[PDB]
Design a binder for these strands. Sequence first.
DNA 1: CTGTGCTCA
Length: 115
Amino acid sequence: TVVEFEELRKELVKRDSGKPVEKIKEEICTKSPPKLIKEIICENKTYADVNIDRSRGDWHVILYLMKHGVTDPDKILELLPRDSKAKENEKWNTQKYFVITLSKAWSVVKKYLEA
DNA sequence: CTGTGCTCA
């Protein structure tokens, strides 16, 4: 388990553009992104304004941000979402969930790059 | 130290 996590850690750092997420957010918001991505990231609203499940709200945007052809764990955390389960800081569950979203999202994105 | 999934069924 932990050995395979370190191998994916080097695969995720390889996919990093080296740029801060605040620039990637503008490169996506200027391209009229999908309705869910546009109203949550490209607008001042949040998951509370669309009443979407917080578990899915994080997962839907993490899939699309990584599908942009670039990935890095720090992008998801520096996006500073207001209702994400990765930032509740109430317990260690936020750290275990943060690895789950990046692990499963990259499995799908890598499958779409390896074709 | 303790869960959390995809678009389109």
